[PDB]
Amino acid sequence: RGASLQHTAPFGCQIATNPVRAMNCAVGNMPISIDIPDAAFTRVVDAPS
Amino acid sequence: GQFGDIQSRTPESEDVYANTQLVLQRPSAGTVHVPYSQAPSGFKYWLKE
Amino acid sequence: NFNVYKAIRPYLAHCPDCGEGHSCHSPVALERIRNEATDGTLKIQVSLQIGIKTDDSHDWTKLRYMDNHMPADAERARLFVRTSAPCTITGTMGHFILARCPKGETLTVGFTDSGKISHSCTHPFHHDPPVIGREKFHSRPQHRKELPCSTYAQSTAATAEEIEVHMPPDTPDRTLMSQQSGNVKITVNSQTVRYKCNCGDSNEGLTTTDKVINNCKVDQCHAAVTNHKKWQYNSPLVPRNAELGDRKGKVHIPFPLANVTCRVPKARNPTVTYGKNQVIMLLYPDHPTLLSYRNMGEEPNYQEEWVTHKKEVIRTVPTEGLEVTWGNNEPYKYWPQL
Amino acid sequence: NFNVYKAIRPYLAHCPDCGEGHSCHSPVALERIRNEATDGTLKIQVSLQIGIKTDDSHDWTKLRYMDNHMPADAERARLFVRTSAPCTITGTMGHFILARCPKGETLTVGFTDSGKISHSCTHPFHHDPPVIGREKFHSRPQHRKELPCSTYAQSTAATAEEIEVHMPPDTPDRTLMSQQSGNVKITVNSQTVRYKCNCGDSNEGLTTTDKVINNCKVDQCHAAVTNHKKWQYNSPLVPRNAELGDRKGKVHIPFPLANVTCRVPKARNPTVTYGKNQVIMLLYPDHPTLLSYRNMGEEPNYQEEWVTHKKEVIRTVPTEGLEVTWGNNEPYKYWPQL
Amino acid sequence: QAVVTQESALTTSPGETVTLTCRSNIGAVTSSNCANWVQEKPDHFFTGLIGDTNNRRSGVPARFSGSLIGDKAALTITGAQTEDEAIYFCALWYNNLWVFGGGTKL
Amino acid sequence: PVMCLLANTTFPCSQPPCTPCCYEKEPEKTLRMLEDNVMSPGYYQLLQASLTCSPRRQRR
User: Fold this and answer.
1) What is the largest CA-CA distance in chain F?
2) What distance in Å separates the CA atoms of residue C222 and residue E53, rounded to the nearest whole number?
3) Which residues pair with C204 in a beta bridge?
4) End-to-end CA distance of chain B
5) Where's it found, cell-wise (chain F) (predicted)?
6) Torsion of CA C22, C28, C33, C37, to 10 degrees
7) Handedness of CA C229, C235, C240, C244 (dihedral sign)
8) N or C: which end of chain C has fewer CB within 10 A?
9) Using CA atoms in the order C91, C92, C97, C98, what is the torsion angle rounded to 10 degrees?
């Protein structure tokens, strides 16, 4: 039988199955692009000194 | 887990130097069962060793 | 309705482990001891029709087999299975028998007959349990980890169940040859008496009544009863019909396996003295524990060990880290403290 | 007089491994497996009145399992102790049952019910006591020394022993109130029935009357059976005073252990050939035989091994002497003379 | 077996003792079963005619009491009348749910 | 909707080609019919219909 992908997790990996899932796939980068509303950012006069 | 986990400061003494790692576990599922994990007999291990 | 035991016919089989070194035509033929039970429910095939009354109906205290060309009905209590210990009987439906028996390499099926006829069914039954969790624990646990596993349940209804029954070859009988003394004065008893007489002229006949032969000895007449009254579970250990081809039926079967769960143990994780990149975990396992260390990054070096006594694993923990899956619990984390 | 079951009560506790994997509230639940005895006396804590009569008789043939609001008395031979197989029960009184079983890791204390309900409490009972001696003994010796060890002795005196005889918990009672015609004509039938309707108004009362309620839960009238007549030796399976404070009691505890001395055998004298500084001894053990050879003086060299097959160990006999002990006989000293 | 049953023709007169059976076959209908001879009207008007297995049935006539009588919960309408004359629906319950049997049309 | 064929005619499934009540009287004819419907999908409903508690000693 042997150890499964959870039992044999390289990469610091979290093995998931049915469906296969990289829970804690410890690798790489994630590009997060937040186009937020700019009116959330109060201006240079909007802040205290 | 030490050989001498129950320390009798007197031979029929009233004090017991004992840190057995008796950790209470989660409750019994719908039935009154004491979920409580402890270390084994350290003098029973001293009986074993 | 479901008169499948009425459709059943008790037929004994020449088993090899019958007791005293002699296996014979007993009603206790272990046909196919299925080890498909993922949780540990053994599905054995029995030579009797277990759970069958004398009229083919339910015998709620009775066990059914074929005794002496008739139904061999007995008590349902005495039919036991000794694999290595007194086995936990699950169910008796037809040939199908449910076993929560002990672990072993052999299996005898010892059934107490009506005249105390303890028929043995001896074979190698390598009863070995499958592993749940990391701990080598045998018992049925009080609390612990949920393992969704198999279980060879005793579903007696034949949903995908099909036993190959058939009218077998002719049941031989030494009483069918009658004392005609040099005549063939064969008594029938109402059976399909295929008598091959060893004398002149008509030394044949699938007779239905008693005959009288001239010039043919009683040792010449080989008589047998026509085994064509019911479908019997046509396994290889039974004498199949050489007078039949493939004319055989398939009836519902017992013992349907299903998916169940199990409770496993998670033992007390020992103290971990943390020194420089190395934590000594003084674990005291009470079952044979699977403790695994894995690297926290790409190069895992996936070590695993089975524990019998207490031991202090000096885990040289990486800077990437170490996953320590001991017991049945979640694996411990090792990040090196700066 | 000591009617120990008078303040006693057979308490059916949820033993998890009862047989067939299911937990059940049987009184043969293994409360406390006292494995303290050095000589093999295992004291199983019995949740029923094992050895005590159900009617409070002191009867060795009567084991009263406190079944369903009554004492149900069964035969004394209904209990076995299958650890690896059924072991020899030495005695059984009330809450205690001290016996001698074989080697094993699970322990199912089987008990006979009144309908033969084999309450076989299966816990993990890792029973194998490490015996002292120069050989790994199995049975009682022909001639051998009585080494002092423990023994769970058969005096059932409740002095220097105690059970935590706390208050009996209130029994749950779904059996009391009926759904008269589909509606609330509920009954008490003679207890401290903590009745509580599934609606306001009639929603309380620890009385013994009937409930005339409508439009609501007929099953919503949920009640309890109050038993203020006896305490119980407060086993951890039993639900304690969370519907109580700390009003707990204490009573005696039987089956008290004391010291004994068990006779163990010593093996045959091995064949010893003494050549030039060399003492070759051929030990053939009947058990795992401790053979230890050391110096007779300041250089210890205290080597020792358990022996399992025939072994012709050649000790280079020291000038300070070869002190060897191979089995339970006293050791040979070697003076390497000449 | 669902029978609060009785004699199939056992009725009283106008003001007569309509003594029907509403009982089980092996003995009585229950009292916590409420073996009664309840009312059965035009359009099958179920109600307490004589109900509760020892007691009366209010909303049925002033005579109707389902009790221990006959060979069952005896639905004794002591003054069951021309307005009380209907199906004495023999009710037998299990102490969880009450089931009407056939009843006796008085 | 089924097509039972008991060597006589293409009858329905449960009301077979010569079904029902096959096992209580002609058990060898039931064995030939279980040769048919053991190889027959529509006679699988005769293997459960005139087979599965549908013999000639069927009491209903």
Assistant:
1) 27
2) 75
3) none
4) 12
5) Host Golgi apparatus, Host trans-Golgi network; Host cell membrane; Host cytoplasm; Host endoplasmic reticulum
6) -140
7) positive
8) C
9) 0
Q: Please judge whether A7 and C300 are an interchain contact, meaning their C-beta atoms are less than 8 angstroms apart.
A: no
- Residues of D within 8 A of C286 (CB-CB) are 124, 126
In angstroms, the separation between the Cα of residue F3 and the nearest Cα of chain C is 19
Classify residue A38 by its DSSP letter.
Answer: G
Q: Do D124 and C140 touch (CB under 8 A)?
A: no
Resolution (A): 5.3
DSSP letter string, C136-169? ---S--SS-EEEEEEE-----S-SS--EEEE--S
3-state secondary structure of B42: helix
**Per the structure block, which two tokens stand in for C301?**
């070096």
The pair of structure tokens assigned to C195 is 């008598």
- Are E74 and E53 in contact, with CB atoms under 8 Å apart? no
Q: Does the CB of A20 have a partner CB in chain C at under 8 Å?
A: no
Experimental method: cryo-EM
CB D134 within 8 A of CB D327: yes
Q: How far apart are CA D310 and CA D1, in angstroms?
A: 60
Start-to-end CA span in chain C (Å): 76
Across the interface, whether the CB atoms of D237 and B33 are under 8 A apart is answered yes
Rounded CA separation C176/C178 (Å): 6
Q: Which residue has the tokens 């589909």?
A: D182
Question: Is D254 within 8 Å of D45 (Cβ atoms)?
Answer: no
Report the alpha-carbon distance of residue C268 to residue C283 in Å, rounded.
8
Measured distance CA(C254)–CA(C44) in Å, rounded: 10
Other CB atoms within a 10 A radius of the CB of residue D252 amount to 17
Contacts of C254 (CB under 8 A, 6+ apart): C43, C91, C93, C94, C95, C96, C97, C154, C155, C156, C157, C158, C161
Q: Quote the DSSP letter at residue E87.
A: E
Residue A7, amino acid: H
Residue-by-residue DSSP string for C23-54: --EES------B---SSS-EEEEEEEEET--T
Tell me the residue length of chain F.
60
Q: In terms of C-beta distances under 8 Å and separation of at least 24 residues, what long-range contacts does B40-44 make, across chains too? A: B40/B1, B40/C284, B40/C286, B40/C310, B41/B5, B42/B1, B42/B2, B42/B3, B42/B4, B42/B5, B42/B6, B43/B3, B43/B4, B43/B5, B43/B6
Question: Which residue type is seen at B41?
Answer: S
Check CB contact of C286 with chain B, cutoff 8 Å. yes
Closest CA to C315 of C330, C307, C304: C304
Q: Phi-psi bin for F25: left (phi > 0), alpha (psi -120 to 50), beta?
A: alpha
Chains F and C touch (3+ CB pairs under 8 A): yes
Q: Which two tokens stand for residue D153?
A: 């002795």
Secondary structure class of C316 (helix, strand, coil)? strand
Whether the CB-CB separation of D101 and D89 falls below 8 Å is answered with no
Q: Closest Cα of chain D to E3: distance in Å? A: 14
Q: Which amino acid is at C144?
A: R
Residues D173 and D124: their CA atoms lie apart, in Å, by: 33
Classify residue D313 by burial, with Cβ atoms within 10 Å: 0-12, 13-18, 19+: middle
D265: β partners: D144
Residue C24 CB partners (closer than 8 Å, separation 6+): C14, C15, C18
Report which residue type is found at C129.
Answer: P
Do B47 and D238 make contact, defined as CB atoms within 8 angstroms?
Answer: no
CA separation for the pair D182, A40 (Å, rounded): 64
Residue D188's contacts (CB-CB under 8 Å, 6 or more residues apart) are D176, D177, D195, D207, D208, D209, D210
